[PDB]
Every structure is written in structure tokens, then in C-alpha cells.
Design a protein around this ligand. Sequence first.
Ligand SMILES: Cc1ccccc1CNC(=O)[C@H]1N(C(=O)[C@@H](O)[C@H](Cc2ccccc2)NC(=O)c2cccc(O)c2C)CSC1(C)C
Lengths: 99, 99
Amino acid sequence: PQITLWKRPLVTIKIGGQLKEALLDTGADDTVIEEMSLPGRWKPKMIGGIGGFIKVRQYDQIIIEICGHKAIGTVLVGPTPVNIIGRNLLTQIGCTLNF
Amino acid sequence: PQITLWKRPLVTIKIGGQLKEALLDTGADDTVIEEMSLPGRWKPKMIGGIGGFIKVRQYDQIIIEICGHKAIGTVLVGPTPVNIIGRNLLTQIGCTLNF
Ligand SMILES: Cc1ccccc1CNC(=O)[C@H]1N(C(=O)[C@@H](O)[C@H](Cc2ccccc2)NC(=O)c2cccc(O)c2C)CSC1(C)C
């Protein structure tokens, strides 16, 4: 698909058995999702940007489905204002910027 | 061009006659640049990032070149992690996400 940037590029994703709306973010190195239950062990971590930092929990080898494409990678869970799909997963679905 | 996301999508921009490195950020609604001198009057603007909301200075109709592509638009100036090229300018230069 070709997504324009007139509005926020929000897509529907499936993670941990639930559906969520998330933002395709080329500025995010990783993927951070609002509080939810995920399998496996996790490690504390801090991520920061505009406005400062927030603490999140890092879960690895998490499967996610975005627009029909299944990808696997690290997923951070914490008090993010918006669910964000970062580069670590964008690469997996063959997402690129074009102009 | 077509930019992959295995590494941060960093580009060289030109603003105020000076070259600077910036991030093509589809998760940012606006373009935020590190402290510098822009002409004209500015107005207040609050933007919400990963860590919360912050106050920045909004300058309109600012000449800026992105990887050789000339543009003229709104540039926000404030405490940012990196120079962020947001959707307002990404759209102007005809940038889209593809997969
Ligand atoms: C988001 C994330 C996920 C995983 C690991 C680290 C991080 C932290 N990275 C970051 O925060 C990076 N940012 C990003 O990835 C941005 O796309 C960011 C995403 C976002 C959207 C809505 C709520 C909260 C965050 N957007 C904004 O900061 C943003 C949002 C709205 C208007 C605006 O003018 C801006 C600059 C811009 S600064 C940054 C290049 C460091």
C-alpha cells in the first residue's frame, strides 16, 4: 500500500490476541505499545524524545500482524500516549519512505 | 529516492543557509528544529511527544531544503532530541510510506 502523510498514518494491528490502532513511525527506533499483557520475560528500559522519557518493559520475539503482514521483534510496553510501530518492525514488512 | 528503515532515516537539510542533519519522521505532525536563528515573528505552540507536552516557537513560511528538495513551511524551534522533519514538510515534498 502507499500511505500519504496528510494525516497521521494509523493502521490496525494484532498483538497478544487483541486489536489495536497504531502509528507507523519512521522516527521511532523501536515499537512501544500501551499497557497490555504479553508473554515471556521482560527487562526495564527508558525511552525518550520530545517531552522527555518514560519507563517501559522490553519483551522480545513478540509476533505482530500489521495490514496482513506478520512480523516478529522486540515490543516495548508502557505509558506511551500513542501506540507506535517503529523501524524494528517497519523493516520487517518492507516499509520504505519514497519521494 | 526510496529510503529503507534498517538505520535511522537521517538526511541533510539546509535552513538559514546552513547544512544540518535531520530525521524523516512520519510519527511527528510538525517539523521541529534545534535552537537557531529564524527571521520574522513567531507564535506559541504546544506539541505532545513520547515524554509529554512542551512549548516551542512556531515560525511560518520558512525556506528549507530537504535532501535537495526545496520547501517552504512551518518550522518549530525548541528542545528536541534531533532535527525532526515532520508530516507537514514530508507531505510537501511528496513523501509517502510504502510496503
Ligand atoms: C517513540 C519511541 C519508540 C521506541 C523507542 C524510543 C522512542 C522515542 N523516540 C521518539 O520519541 C522519537 N520521536 C518520534 O518517533 C516521533 O514520531 C513522535 C511519535 C509520538 C507521537 C505521539 C505521541 C508520542 C510520540 N512524535 C512527536 O514527537 C510529535 C508528535 C506530534 C507533533 C509533533 O510536532 C511531534 C514532534 C521524535 S523524537 C525521537 C526521534 C527521539
